[PDB]
Amino acid sequence: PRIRIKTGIEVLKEQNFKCLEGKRVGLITNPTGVDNHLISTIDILHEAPNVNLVALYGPEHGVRGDVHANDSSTGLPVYSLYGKTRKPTPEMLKDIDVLVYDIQDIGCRSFTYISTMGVAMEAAAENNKEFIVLDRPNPIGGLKIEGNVVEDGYISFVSQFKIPYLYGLTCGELALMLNGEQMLSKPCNLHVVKMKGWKRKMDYVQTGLQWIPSSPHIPHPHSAFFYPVSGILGELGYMSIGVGYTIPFQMFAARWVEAEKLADNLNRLHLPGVIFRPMHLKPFYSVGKEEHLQGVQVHIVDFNKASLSEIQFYVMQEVTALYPDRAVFDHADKERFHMFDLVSGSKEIRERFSQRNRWEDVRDYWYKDVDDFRRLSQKYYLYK
Ligand SMILES: [K+]
The missing domain is CATH 3.40.50.12170 (Uncharacterised protein PF07075, DUF1343)
Structure with a gap:
């Protein structure tokens, strides 16, 4: 030490x-x-x-x-x-x-x-x-x-x-x-x-x-790596991203998800340095407070290899492919879309993602x- x-x-x-x-x-x-x-x-x-x-x-x-x-x-x-x-x-x-x-x-x-x-x-x-x-x-x-x-x-x-x-x-x-x-x-x-x-x-x-x-929801040094993993989607208060639970920013969950299906679909993407693990939880406060939710914990097994901020978009993509009537920009609070655009630094991220809920339609803009x-x-x- x-x-x-x-x-x-x-x-x-x-x-x-x-x-x-x-x-x-x-x-x-x-x-x-x-x-x-x-x-x-x-x-x-x-x-x-x-x-x-x-x-x-x-x-x-x-x-x-x-x-x-x-x-x-x-x-x-x-x-x-x-x-x-x-x-x-x-x-x-x-x-x-x-x-x-x-x-x-x-x-x-x-x-x-x-x-x-x-x-x-x-x-x-x-x-x-x-x-x-x-x-x-x-x-x-x-x-x-x-x-x-x-x-x-x-x-x-x-x-x-x-x-x-x-x-x-x-x-x-x-x-x-x-x-x-x-x-x-x-x-x-x-x-x-x-x-x-x-x-x-x-x-x-x-x-x-x-x-x-x-800040209260960045309690540990590893929490700084996870804030950009889920923080943009987090602006909408649509899915739980662990804010309201004991692993803030390290997960994605909702009451209408089947954990094992979401984890299997995300692990099939073979994102470098990441493993998705199925989880069941009941938040204590904030999003989904006192409701039984299902989703994934994002485990970063190699911090140098992982591309952090794109993870929420792959989660949104795979969640929507499994539950097409639950698309984020079809059902999230419209009053929070401007905040999503500000945090993203452009309305292009939401607008391009909203076309067919595919990260590939946004990726070039994110890396330009x-x-x-x-x-x-x-x-x-x-x-x-
Ligand atoms: K002094």
Whole structure:
């Protein structure tokens, strides 16, 4: 048992917080912003005598994770970066010189912490404030790139930048790209505190760090791999994807499915690195609460070989072939289709899939931007 890397916060401590000296510091963080001893970056900067920590900013789900105003332990003002104020206002920034960002994300575009980062960067740029990212590992590694980039009509808080669905960058590398490619409204005075020892091949468990639930339904490091497996279909609340049960994002089920038939049809696809297992369950809450459901558990037996985000579409395809009168876009809540399109970064994914419920009619669109994005990413990589 050993921590094999130095996170941005560990590097900042080793540098005795030099890049923060003489500045009024604002800190964007949540319960994942901790050092190797699981002490919060809030308490580290508050206790450092050469750091003037003056304000805290909490993203989706909150800062001490207790809201989901002033901080009890430090007495510092706490600002909410969600809903109407997802982007810091000029009034929220008048009391600081630099915004420090320290949050563990999951390497998926629809997870809104990276949206908070980019929009806070843009607010910093527009108000002449410095922005510092304390870099953290990409928990699914720095090699997988999947999905089309976001189209203009589908840019939103759950699809904030023209990057793929799995974008393969650390939050620090993404910040550098947003700045370098003029993807935000104005250039930002950005500094990234680079990690030591992190490698693109590393998944989170290989770093040796503890995983703090990124959000309630991403409780374990392996859960970050499964969020893109089922998360897009999950926006509809049509089938259970395990949210409401004890393996969130790792399964697909409904009351009208025959588990063994669905598993047999999916295993016949021979998707690399995946095995589907039939299952029977009764959700405790959310979708299918207290109903007997049947479906499949998705077991990833080789994380390097598996193409993650396409799995929900193969499941939708095979479920529909078995139960043709249960097609997702024929029976799911129509009021959730716009959200599905936003998370997908285009209405083309739903529209092409809806023609005959076949992934082959969407696959080329899903893969079209990978080679161009990998080439663009090489300009900003910090780690080998
Ligand atoms: K301090």
